[PDB]
Amino acid sequence: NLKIFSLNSNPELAKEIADIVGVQLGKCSVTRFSDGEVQINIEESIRGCDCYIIQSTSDPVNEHIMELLIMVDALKRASAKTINIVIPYYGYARQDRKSREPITAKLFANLLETAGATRVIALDLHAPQIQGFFDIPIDHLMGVPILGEYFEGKNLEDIVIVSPDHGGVTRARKLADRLKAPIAIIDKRMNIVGNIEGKTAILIDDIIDTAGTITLAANALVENGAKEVYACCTHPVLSGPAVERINNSTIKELVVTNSIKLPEEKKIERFKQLSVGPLLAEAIIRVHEQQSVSYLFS
Amino acid sequence: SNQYGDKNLKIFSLNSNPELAKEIADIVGVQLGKCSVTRFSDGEVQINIEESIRGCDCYIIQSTSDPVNEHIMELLIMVDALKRASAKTINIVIPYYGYARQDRKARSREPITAKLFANLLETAGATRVIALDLHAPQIQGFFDIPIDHLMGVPILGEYFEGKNLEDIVIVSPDHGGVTRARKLADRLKAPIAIIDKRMNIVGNIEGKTAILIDDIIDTAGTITLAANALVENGAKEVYACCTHPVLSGPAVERINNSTIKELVVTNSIKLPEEKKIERFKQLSVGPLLAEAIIRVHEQQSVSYLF
Amino acid sequence: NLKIFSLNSNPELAKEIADIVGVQLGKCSVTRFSDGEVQINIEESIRGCDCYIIQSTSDPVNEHIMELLIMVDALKRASAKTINIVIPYYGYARQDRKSREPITAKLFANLLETAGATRVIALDLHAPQIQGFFDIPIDHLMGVPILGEYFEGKNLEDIVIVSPDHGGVTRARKLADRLKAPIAIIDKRMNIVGNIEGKTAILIDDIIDTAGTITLAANALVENGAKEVYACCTHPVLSGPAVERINNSTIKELVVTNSIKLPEEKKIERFKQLSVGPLLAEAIIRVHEQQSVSYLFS
Amino acid sequence: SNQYGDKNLKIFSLNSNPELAKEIADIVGVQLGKCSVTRFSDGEVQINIEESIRGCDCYIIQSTSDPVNEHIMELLIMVDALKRASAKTINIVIPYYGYARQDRKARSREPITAKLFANLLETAGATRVIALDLHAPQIQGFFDIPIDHLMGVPILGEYFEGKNLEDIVIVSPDHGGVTRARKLADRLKAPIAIIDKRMNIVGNIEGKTAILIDDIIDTAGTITLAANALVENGAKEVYACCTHPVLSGPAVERINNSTIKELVVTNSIKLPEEKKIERFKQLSVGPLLAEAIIRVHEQQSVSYLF
Amino acid sequence: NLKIFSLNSNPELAKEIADIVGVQLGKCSVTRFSDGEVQINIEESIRGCDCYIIQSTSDPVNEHIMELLIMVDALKRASAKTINIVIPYYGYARQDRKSREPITAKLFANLLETAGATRVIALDLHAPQIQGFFDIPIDHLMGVPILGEYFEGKNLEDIVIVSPDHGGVTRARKLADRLKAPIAIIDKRMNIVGNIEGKTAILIDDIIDTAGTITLAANALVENGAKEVYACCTHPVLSGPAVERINNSTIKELVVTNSIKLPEEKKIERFKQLSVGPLLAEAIIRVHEQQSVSYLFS
Amino acid sequence: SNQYGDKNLKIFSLNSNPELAKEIADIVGVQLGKCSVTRFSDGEVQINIEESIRGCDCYIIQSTSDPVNEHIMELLIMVDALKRASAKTINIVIPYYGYARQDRKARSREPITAKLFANLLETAGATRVIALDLHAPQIQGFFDIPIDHLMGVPILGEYFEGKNLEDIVIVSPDHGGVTRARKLADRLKAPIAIIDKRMNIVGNIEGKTAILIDDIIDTAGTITLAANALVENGAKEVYACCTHPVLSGPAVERINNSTIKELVVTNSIKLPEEKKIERFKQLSVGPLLAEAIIRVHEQQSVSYLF
């Protein structure tokens, strides 16, 4: 009665999740015709079934967004009982506030409901208030505990968590609480606010895109006395020259999760990727079986 | 082209067909609204309108052609941006409506994408739509906001009329396009014939000038096979025409190597600069759409057009 | 738990369907007061029940449409679990496109959802895109296979399927595919496009209303060499002089289905009526039990 | 009657009450919008507006009287047609609101048809409504679009005042109409009395001129029984009045054979040409509705009226 | 699987109802911060549960309305299966018609649905057409039978039911039918229409607010020949000087129900309070178990 | 103040902040719309607009401050009243947005009240909103109707600039307010420092004039503790400021007894007349909001402001 489908964004994450929960991915067909149009065909009856769709809205966001919406349409029209969306990475999440700009994080939310979505399971939205962009139920999972565990196990002396900017202090502090460490912040107006002399710095962000911000912060820490610099994020967008910039940086090791598929192309030298696979598989089971999802936060 | 005199009419162009959009604006007499549609390295689209449009009637010109998904998204984001900046109205001029084909795959559990698009456009905040030659006229019923549907057949007809042709027969490429072939046949007082690919011909095409008409020419497999079977059955000559030149895949090579004397299309879809069609004529829908926007904005009768 | 109700359009079809699935029709009351107003009263508790309403929106369409909407309102307000509409004939289906006309096929759809409908089961809509007029689930049944079977069993030599016009070629061809026959079409601008000399013609349409189109086509076929003319449609609207025109025509036999009740009044001489009763009863069971409805098309 | 001077005000009439609709248009000073509401042989209604109304404020005059289902449908289809032809506004003037009776059948699992209608009208696309003497004033709450509710009592009162009557008592036909009898009693500074059919009389009606008032007179069973019991209890005389003359079934014969001296009604519902009431007076709501449409269109105070 | 919560309006009624149906009230938290804002926190997982909320929208109506809406929001966002609202007293019910006034009874209804309500159970709405203000299911319970039983048991000779005004005649008559008594009405334009000489009068209304209307009617009855005056209503709003006015009136006994909590403050001397507790507990069970609720009216 | 000359602009005040509302109206040049918001003995709110506003653009000024529930309700009822009286637009000017705090209680199963409010306002019938210093800028995303968000920081900055201060450091009271401290630091070309209460200080505050900035000062526990720890760590002096003076509970006594040299706030929330702050300065948002309403009404650029 529970059917899980995967689309093109992150097929491997979807498979890992399916193996853990114990189902074969649903029979669907995702064709792209020669003129660029996409067509999904549900290759099996899903009438009366609770359907889960696993899709990160990563590069190319607009293709991933449309195939997800078109698939929801096909399931709604094929009489699915529920259409539950599992989103490891929420694209356009940085477009969450307005000078004559759209609020794309909100537009997508409205689009998703319009298409027929029942509920959403999300992981580390750029802003916690993005939950409020929905009127359908949404269960928000956090990735900070996963990154925090890995660092807690590295036997690092003298650490200070560093927020790459003014908007990342809250996140920095959740990590500094978990690790019992002080916080410093970069104030590119690029000044270092806080004590980092001799300390092992851990730069943290939710998303690492072009990596300009992170590598620059890293270089600044090192020439201001930091013993060493580590860097982590939940979502590895890593577009453009991101990878190169990181390989040449002073960043000892970069730690990311697998919410976004890694560039087949470019390789990161000092890197560690943690899986959110178990977290999502478990959240899917509890949502479907109506157990407590919040048991997952404490 | 500044000459319009209603500073309250704004026209924006997205990336699908900037040339057509420029032509329309020029004809109307106004400069393209100022905005920037950029794509960050991660493929996300960013839009920021560069002049206040608060209280203005805005017109967005976008064909949802290859790649349809990107063009739909920038269109939706553009509308969200104008809605939030307090535009008075957000009018959508769609020269080509992507996903309008409902039969593409002959399957069971399919989506009805042309309907999903309509719902999405309305949700984004569209006030109305101006469309041209929708694949099926009942797509108008997919909207609950006003939609004005323009016909491209008169333009094509007027062109063929000017060629002074003898013994013509309008040919429908398949079963679904007989109504459309009939409209051209009426404009040209010519009989019709249809290709029954199951590849037979219903009608007398012998020693006549055949004109193949379809709404869309995509891979060109259908139209070229229909042109060849036409000639080899005695048609003296074959012209082909359509409103929307999708021309994907091998379309061009197929056309260049076929017996089609001349292919006639409109500029509702931007042509591939890459490859050239040899025997080709392109008619413009710029004046037709420009006239439509003016009558809609000023509240004049547009049915008069079409 | 499954309750089936019938309204005034086609009580006999409703009864046949109820007998096949194995239920007594629900206890409802359809009163028309002296001033013309209608009042439905559900004569039994249907709280928590999945309710099916059988109604063709045939002559008078506006009365049939309103009693259906008022009944949906009473069931919604009486806490029905689901309100499933079974529509053998969809009136106003020819009003599916716009010069300053409404798109009544779309208006009705919106009205139906507004009133509280859960889903729809339809049979041979004038246009397949009318399915897209709904946002609630709709399962579209075809009648061509039923008419096609009957002709396949008549031992007719030399046949050609004839589309009475430009808009009926697709339908004609589905019948010509099933019967392995060529197609011809009438081009009233009234010319016959295609070879019909000595052939047995079968004129096909979805709806036969005043029958002017069909009888004229039939007369034209016969004076252009056709050995004989048969005629069929799924929906027998047959209004005005329809019947007389058919009785005097050259039409050997007219074949229709029972999606619309036959005029108690006027009688057709050479005629055959096939029942969609089994098709709908079966579609109702599969929808309710969540089996595959598409198994019914192949 | 061309004299209005705001070519932007359009008024349409459907089939329920063309005479009333003509009177209103005449008074306003405009010609009835051009359209054709035809019914094909199969009973389907076809509408096609014969002049552009794009950008115009349209007023539709339709009472949903016998047969209510047909009149509702043509009204809904008319609105869909105007919405899709780009009307600026679609204003509904309903002289008589069908299905406004909620108690007709005393059952359990009933529909609330007056609410369903409101939802349907809004869904079709109505901008606002102008109504007259709704059976229950809270039906105004059934709408989420603006609704202006006009009262017919002043017109009736003004008529009775002009008769110079002595010793009058306003009689409520039943328990639900006491508030309405009270309003007339206020206009005429007269006391009230009520018929408690369980058929007793609460109040002193002895040797007085009784005036029975109701909102609707349908089969006339209630009003005639109430008039007879009135006379036989000593009332010197009995007048009867209402806003809406539904007059279905035996209504007329019952009235003609009753003791009602004179029945007074308005023209909110078209009268049966077939049968004649003998002692009868019909007051017009044409001027009242015409004045309402003008103030709504020009944005003037209409509460001033009512 | 059935969880019942109570908010601040009438905690005792909620408890009585919970005891009868056989559940402990749900674990929720209703905090009012120092600046006046309210925060509800569901202290237990209610995922997949049918939740009932017991709240009268009595003084202060706006606080009671908001805490109810905020609670519905928290349950909707915490994935409740259904959110069923039980409303013993419906505030703003007198704002049911429009000169440039709002129709607050309708606004609240729209607000309730917007917040996420599934259905409503109501008791004696000011106007029966207020049921039509909703599009979600609503089951309307009557209190007249409860007041009527109590009077039927008092051995009162010569009774006449009295409507305090023009709008209360229908209600008066339902009570006069149950008791086989004649009706009289007060016509404050303050005249007494009907025979009350020597009779025992029972003044009836739905709501007794400031009690000016009722006490004045009572005084008028007594100086016009009435042997004695009784007074009843379903909803005891009793605000301002209500209580004092009643204690000094000629009203022999005032009978009310417990749909609204009684002023802790002021005491009524000759009074009787009947409980709607059993009625609501029973309606809750039948709604939840899908039995017939209308069995409760006859 | 009658001088505006667009009889079509109406401005109403509810009970949250009548003084601010009066100031705005005065500046604009119009008299407060006429209405009565009364509360019957039972606490129900009654509203009845005393002049026709049919066709007028109406502006409602209401802060949803203590008690937020009453103020929200009168606001919602006011909108229902204007919608039903046929106002053309219903524009909401919210100087202070109650329930904008999402972290107040650190629990699991919570409501998102700021979102519920937005949905309710839209449902009531709001056309648009004008807000000032929302607690989180993404609350703008909670609305699907246009919302113009004004910033109070420039006003505060301009005041501090006029004091001619030396060696200043802008201090963020907590982790969530670093972006806001940064904006003031930009206006004053000053570095920033943050209080890491887990109560340590990140940044050099030694011998400097510290300026604490927050959006809201409620019980004042956070700001006063942050001011004290500042001084005892060597800050030469401490100023404190915020846009919204909620000042609930012991706020005032705490401030009066702290080391804050001067507390600066705006008049977005009505101050308690009861208790006085000793070292205090109140800047007005009346001119800022008045300018915003005019540009919105006349369709001028308001981003120019903020």
Side-chain angles (χ1 to χ4, degrees), chain B:
Chain B
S1 323
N2 166 124
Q3 301 304 125
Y4 189 59
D6 192 331
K7 211 166 278 56
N8 247 62
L9 198 168
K10 285 280 129 59
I11 301 177
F12 293 91
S13 182
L14 283 169
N15 291 290
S16 70
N17 201 355
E19 281 123 63
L20 177 55
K22 179 52 165 74
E23 177 184 347
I24 288 163
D26 280 341
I27 297 178
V28 174
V30 306
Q31 296 276 107
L32 291 169
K34 291 178 312 303
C35 65
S36 43
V37 52
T38 81
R39 264 175 127 243
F40 306 93
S41 326
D42 55 349
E44 283 174 17
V45 161
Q46 182 43 316
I47 290 169
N48 58 206
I49 316 301
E50 329 223 304
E51 50 173 322
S52 182
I53 45 66
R54 179 179 295 272
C56 296
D57 296 295
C58 309
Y59 286 81
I60 308 170
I61 303 184
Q62 179 86 313
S63 273
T64 48
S65 53
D66 193 3
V68 62
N69 297 345
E70 293 284 344
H71 290 142
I72 283 164
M73 284 309 300
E74 56 179 36
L75 172 57
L76 293 173
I77 298 180
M78 182 55 178
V79 177
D80 183 83
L82 290 165
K83 194 187 63 170
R84 296 188 202 268
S86 296
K88 188 199 213 182
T89 58
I90 311 184
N91 313 290
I92 325 299
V93 187
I94 306 174
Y96 174 65
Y97 195 109
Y99 286 120
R101 273 165 298 164
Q102 219 144 111
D103 42 19
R104 312 203 65 180
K105 293 209 126 279
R107 294 323 239 103
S108 201
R109 315 165 191 96
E110 298 161 298
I112 300 180
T113 321
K115 175 71 191 289
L116 172 67
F117 176 64
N119 285 358
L120 298 188
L121 200 59
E122 298 186 4
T123 288
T127 305
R128 69 165 63 246
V129 179
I130 294 176
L132 158 68
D133 284 344
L134 297 163
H135 176 66
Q138 35 281 116
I139 295 180
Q140 275 181 105
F142 287 180
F143 288 81
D144 292 300
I145 56 187
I147 175 162
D148 285 318
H149 185 206
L150 307 175
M151 309 297 249
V153 157
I155 302 177
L156 300 165
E158 179 187 295
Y159 173 75
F160 282 115
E161 183 176 67
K163 288 198 111 47
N164 283 338
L165 300 178
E166 284 156 303
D167 305 313
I168 48 210
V169 51
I170 311 293
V171 182
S172 181
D174 59 40
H175 327 96
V178 187
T179 302
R180 193 180 306 111
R182 145 79 193 224
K183 282 179 200 180
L184 191 58
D186 275 334
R187 214 274 179 222
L188 277 14
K189 314 176 144 62
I192 64 172
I194 109 150
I195 300 290
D196 186 18
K197 192 243 285 181
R198 220 66 98 78
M199 182 153 247
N200 286 102
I201 291 170
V202 184
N204 178 29
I205 68 156
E206 254 263 334
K208 293 183 155 298
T209 298
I211 307 187
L212 285 154
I213 174 175
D214 210 350
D215 64 327
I216 291 163
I217 283 177
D218 183 12
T219 62
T222 293
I223 199 88
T224 61
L225 257 24
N228 287 5
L230 274 177
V231 160
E232 97 174 53
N233 272 260
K236 163 178 52 292
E237 266 185 331
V238 177
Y239 288 80
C241 70
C242 72
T243 309
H244 319 288
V246 167
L247 306 170
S248 76
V252 178
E253 293 53 50
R254 275 179 181 170
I255 295 174
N256 289 334
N257 291 324
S258 64
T259 45
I260 291 163
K261 184 179 181 68
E262 185 186 37
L263 168 76
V264 179
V265 305
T266 80
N267 62 345
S268 62
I269 290 170
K270 161 175 164 48
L271 245 22
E273 32 238 339
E274 315 164 290
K275 7 159 68 191
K276 205 146 59 53
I277 293 102
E278 293 153 25
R279 277 113 47 223
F280 151 96
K281 178 59 187 140
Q282 183 172 236
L283 301 192
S284 196
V285 294
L288 171 63
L289 293 173
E291 186 59 26
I293 294 194
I294 284 161
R295 294 167 162 302
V296 152
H297 181 71
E298 276 163 41
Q299 320 288 34
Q300 305 307 286
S301 162
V302 338
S303 78
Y304 129 110
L305 210 69
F306 273 158

Side-chain angles (χ1 to χ4, degrees), chain F residues 205-239:
Chain F
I205 68 156
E206 254 262 334
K208 293 183 155 298
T209 298
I211 307 187
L212 285 154
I213 174 175
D214 210 350
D215 64 327
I216 291 163
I217 283 177
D218 183 12
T219 62
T222 293
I223 199 88
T224 61
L225 257 24
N228 287 5
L230 274 177
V231 160
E232 97 174 53
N233 272 260
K236 163 178 52 292
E237 266 185 331
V238 177
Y239 288 80

Side-chain angles (χ1 to χ4, degrees), chain D residues 199-219:
Chain D
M199 182 153 247
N200 286 102
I201 291 170
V202 184
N204 178 29
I205 68 156
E206 254 262 334
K208 293 183 155 298
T209 298
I211 307 187
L212 285 154
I213 174 175
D214 210 350
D215 64 327
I216 291 163
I217 283 177
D218 183 12
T219 62

